[model samples]
Target: SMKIDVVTIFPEYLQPVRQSLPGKAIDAGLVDVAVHDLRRWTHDVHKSVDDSPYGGGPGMVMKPTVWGDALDEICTSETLLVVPTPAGYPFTQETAWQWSTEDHLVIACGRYEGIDQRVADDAATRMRVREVSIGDYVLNGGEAAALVIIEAVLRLVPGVLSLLEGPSYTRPPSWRGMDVPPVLLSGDHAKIAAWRAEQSRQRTIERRPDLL
Candidate 1:
């Protein structure tokens, strides 16, 4: 079991996790999750969390002080602080599998120009800090990416069939000018299994040869 804490400015974006598999896991007591509004820790009339970058940039940088206050109370010796940013290490199924073993996770959803670098630098001295990007492309903020990361990790928390699945179909085998592979409908378990395994291999090789 693991406990996860997510800190974000747009808490609403994370609400779906509460209604999906993650929510079911929480109900079963398999995992614990808490989503917090980053503004809750701000101490100003406007509750601002971003400031101009030190060297003048195209966008504002998330204030270190705000993040500092938020994470200081949330992290512990067993915690892993995950900061979602495009400038971070590539996040993959490999990373998700590794993270699934963590006892606690704190995902900090950074916005604007991203959080001040010092936050990760300093946090590294306390708990493990991982700056992870879901993919090479960028997005508005880290909320969606965090969702991707959480879903991937949660699946590994229980596990899956293969690293990736091949094509699958249902009835209406002769519909749409196509046919279900004859072997699949043959009612021969060993033959069907072999066909599925070969299909999985070919699909992986065609699209993701890296997995080989």
Candidate 2:
């Protein structure tokens, strides 16, 4: 089973993960997921984890010390550490497939300005550290992005979708113009495959030209 650990300040925010598809994956033993509170690693009286930016930035930056300790305890050599940010590489279906192969994963969800650079740099040395963005905008925190990734990646895990026929079972091509494609209805495997591929490419080009 693949294991995923999420380190964030608001552990309650991850409730959806434990109640949805990710939760199903956990229940089936296909994946192991744990959400840790970042504040638990804080040593100060107020349980503080952020500070004003060193270079006089506008917002608070998450402290590296707390993040480092949390990550160090959870990550392993086979872990993929993902840090979500607007400035990171675009998250894609291909990226999800790549991450699903890892034995373990560590997702760091940042708030305010962002996590301290040292935390990211340190994690990079031991595991595959990637800064990924779901789209071309900013969010209040990385929780949403992390959730998006977990769902997408978990679907690609070996046993997660085994009960289903295959990945293309519900693809867009199967339903064209609000109706089932004639080829799919006919049950002709070869023609269905060709139609799905063409539709997938056309859809990608129409909706996400950047992907092409």
Candidate 3:
């Protein structure tokens, strides 16, 4: 079984993780997940996790001590850790497949201006730390991005998608004046497989040529 730990300031943001494949996997005893509140590590009465940047900046940076303590308590040397950041490596389906084999995964959510650099640096001393970005754009928080990653990763786990019958069409294949392609009804397994693969590639090429 795999174990995943998510550390973030906004615990509510990850509640939906338990509602997707990740949650389904948990219910099936294939994995486990724990969401930690970053403020739990704070010592001050305000539980403040952010502070103004050293130089002039538009927003604040997450404080080092809080993240440092949070990560220190959540991870171990065997953990595959990640930080969701725009400046990190591009996240991809290939990367998702790669992560599916890990025994443990830990993610830190970045908010405000950014996470304190030292938190990642310290984590690297023990765990396998990576900073990964979901796409070319930015989100208000890492939770949404984390959800995207979790879904991609969970479906890649063996047996998680066995119930899916590839692509399917129902009896009412003709809809809105559009007819289902005749090749699908030809009753030829090889041809159907070829068509599905080709259709999949064509859509990727049209919408995301970079995937090719």
Q: Give the best candidate by TM-score.
A: 1
User: Which residue pairs does candidate 1 place in steric collision?
Assistant: none
> Please, what are the lDDT tens digits per residue for candidate 2 over residues 1-212?
78889989989989888766545656788887789999889979999999899869588999888888888888887788899999899999889988888888889999999999988898878777999999988899999899999999988888876011222445465354565445777878998877777777777766667755
Candidate ordering by TM-score (highest first): 1, 3, 2
Candidate 2 clashes between residue pairs 3 or more apart in a chain or in different chains: none
Writing each residue's lDDT as its tens digit, candidate 1 over 48-167 gives 999998978699999999999999989987899999999998998789989998889999998888899999999999889999888879898999998999888887786221535878
Over 4 Å off, model 1: 21-24, 158-164, 188-194, 209-212
**Candidate 2 Cα misplacement greater than 4 A, ranges:** 21-28, 162-212
Q: For model 3, what is the C-alpha lDDT against the true structure? A: 0.83
Order of quality (lDDT)? 1, 2, 3
As for lDDT, the candidate ahead, 1 or 3, is 1
* Top-scoring candidate (lDDT): 1
* Number of clashing residue pairs, candidate 1: 0
Off by over 4 Å in 3: 21-28, 159-168, 188-205
